[PDB]
Amino acid sequence: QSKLGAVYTEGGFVEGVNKKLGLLGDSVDIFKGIPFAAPTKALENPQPHPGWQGTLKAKNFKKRCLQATITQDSTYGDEDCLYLNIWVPQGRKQVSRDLPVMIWIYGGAFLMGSGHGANFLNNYLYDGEEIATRGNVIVVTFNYRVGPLGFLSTGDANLPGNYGLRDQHMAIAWVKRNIAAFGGDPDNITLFGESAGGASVSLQTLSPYNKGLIRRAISQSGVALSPWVIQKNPLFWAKKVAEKVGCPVGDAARMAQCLKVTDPRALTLAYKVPLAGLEYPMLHYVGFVPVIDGDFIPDDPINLYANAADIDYIAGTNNMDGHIFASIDMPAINKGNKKVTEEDFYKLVSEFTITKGLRGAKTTFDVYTESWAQDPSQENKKKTVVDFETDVLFLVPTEIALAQHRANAKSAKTYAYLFSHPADHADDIQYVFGKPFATPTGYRPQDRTVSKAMIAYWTNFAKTGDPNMGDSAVPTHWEPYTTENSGYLEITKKMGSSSMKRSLRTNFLRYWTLTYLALPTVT
Ligand code: NA
Ligand SMILES: [Zn+2]
Ligand SMILES: [Zn+2]
Ligand SMILES: [Zn+2]
Ligand SMILES: [Zn+2]
Ligand SMILES: [Zn+2]
Ligand SMILES: [Zn+2]
Ligand SMILES: [Zn+2]
Ligand SMILES: [Zn+2]
Ligand SMILES: [Zn+2]
Ligand SMILES: [Zn+2]
Incomplete structure (x- = not known):
């Protein structure tokens, strides 16, 4: 009476696990490996x-989709990978009903990742238990195809x-279609995701495929407008893979058919992204990412809001x-003991600004190095390089998306954040998922x-669209974003009224x- 038992889904009955929590009757029902789509066929x-x-016994995580290992010399995963958890x-009285539902989308540059995430201190990064039980929401994770x-x-x-x-x-x-059977409110689905998953969240909100499916969304460190998201020249990357696996490159239709019948592991390992001794910035080697297809993404994302x-919509970035x-x-x-000059x-700036030529390289270099005269230290110079990359890859796209979302809003509310701390300890995913509570030996009270x-904030927002209103108290009133106030919440280890900032x-x-x-384009 206080737990789900076998759950009736469109595909048939599903049985998960009930895990007792605390001493007084609370628990959590865990389902792993529920198929939401057939075994995939290549491309x-x-x-x-x-x-x-x-x-169906939904007792264990299922295989991720086929992807390169980090060494890039081999693969793992399987074509049968479209599973969710x-x-x-x-609570201790009766079975949950009408709960908000949060669907996580992982990142990994569209090249790698799975629904459970990295395992550390005997705990998967995307284990949804802490969010679910602390915010009284349902959490869904899942696999999608990468690379x-x-x-x-x-x-x-x-x-x-x-x-x-x-x-x-x-x-x-x-x-x-199915979450009400688990005690969820299907009218109240919130997507959230980080990096490539944040850009994914963004693209899902912009696609007409999702009309009437999504109530709310959170983009963490990535939006559809980030420069690494849309591949402008996919045929170049497809020809590169075709040459490497022995497919002819003259006719696009014959090339496509040959790629579809190439060993999926050879396709996956065809191109190795180099991380040392590079001619162009890391961005340039981001190849296998979303495209404007005239279908799922009907137009440039900036026109879809x-x-x-x-x-x-919440969108924010990490410092x-x-x-x-x-x-x-x-x-x-x-x-x-090595100098940035x-x-x-x-040189790095000129690579990023080539469409605006010499003039664009200089205006950009001059604005970012203005502070170097008075502070020529390496601490300031190296922080400038990080700020430059953060600006162009994450912060500026996120601010443009916030503005477009606010400008197109009817009933939608808009919120902005900046996360600052002190995988690296500076990354916000582990705090969103409650790892400092799930594995407390690895973390400090702060x-x-x-x-x-x-x-x-995240689960209040899921429940109500208002991060200040819900089942949980918050340390700072989070003001909705408008063009006028351009406010963002600065999330740190000590929050109070001044944590609500602007511009x-x-x-x-x-x-x-x-x-x-406003600069001329050069050719
Ligand atoms: Na756990
Ligand atoms: Zn199956
Ligand atoms: Zn695994
Ligand atoms: Zn297989
Ligand atoms: Zn109901
Ligand atoms: Zn559909
Ligand atoms: Zn490039
Ligand atoms: Zn160049
Ligand atoms: Zn810390
Ligand atoms: Zn991150
Ligand atoms: Zn207010």
Whole structure:
């Protein structure tokens, strides 16, 4: 009476696990490995999964979709990978009903990842138990196709691309049809995701495929407008893979058919992204990502925001989201005894600004190095490189998306955040998922303070669209974003009234959105 038992879904009965929590009757029902789509076929759209007889034991995580290992010398996963997982919190009196539902989309540059995430201190990163039980929401995680198998495209009808985005959509659609049986409110689905998953969340809100499916969304460190999201020249990347696996490149239709019948592991390992000794910035080697296909993504994402007019929206970034990419593009910021120079930074800036030529490289270099005269230290110079990467890859796109969402809003509310701390300890996913509570030996009291606050805001927002209103108290009133106030919440280990701030790096935003765009394009 106080737990689910066998659950009736469209595909048949599903049985998970009940885990007692605390001493007084609370618990959580855990389902792992529920199929939401058929075994995949290489470079084909996802299809319904056939029903089953009897009761499916949803007891263990299922295989991720085929992807390269981090060494890039081998693969793991499987073509049969479109599975999802569900945590349902339970009180001590009766079974939960009408709960908000949060669907997580993982990141990993569209190239890697799974619904459970990295395992550390005997705990998977995306284990939904802490969010579910602390915020009284249902949490869903799931796998989607990544790499060439997720995103290879010719930019035309021969190989339209976006397979991995369709997989995400199929999991959302399944949740809408089925989650009420688990005690969820299907009218109240919130998507949330980080990095590539934040851009995915964004793209899902913009696609007409999701009309009437999504109530709210949270983009963490990535939006559809980030420069690494849309591949402008997919046929170049598809030809590269075709040459490497022995397919002819002259006819796009014959090339597409040959790629579809190539060993999926050879497609996956065809291109290795190099991380050392690179001619262009790390961005340039981001290949197998979403495309504008005229279908799932009907137009450039910037023109699609009418589709999210009634989707409440949080978007924010991490203080040093650009750090990883800065480290690759300028290794000197790692070694304490190696100098970043004006010449190194000019070069990096010029690569990012080539469509605006010499004039665009200089205006950008000059604005970012203005502070170097009075503060020429390496601490300031290296922080400038990180800020530059954070700005162009994450912060500026996120601010443009916030503005477009606010400008197209009907009933939708808009919220902005900046996360600042002190995987790296600086990353916000582990606090969103409550790892400082799930594995407390790895974390300090301040970490559990940060995590407690983020879960309160995230799950209040899921319940009501208002991060200040719900089952949890919050430390700072989070003011909805408008163009007038341009307010963002600064999330740190000590929050109070002054944590609600405004005009985040506004001179740099204005530089990129007005000054830099007002420059002539060069060829
Ligand atoms: Na757990
Ligand atoms: Zn199956
Ligand atoms: Zn696994
Ligand atoms: Zn297989
Ligand atoms: Zn009801
Ligand atoms: Zn659909
Ligand atoms: Zn490039
Ligand atoms: Zn160049
Ligand atoms: Zn992150
Ligand atoms: Zn900490
Ligand atoms: Zn207010």
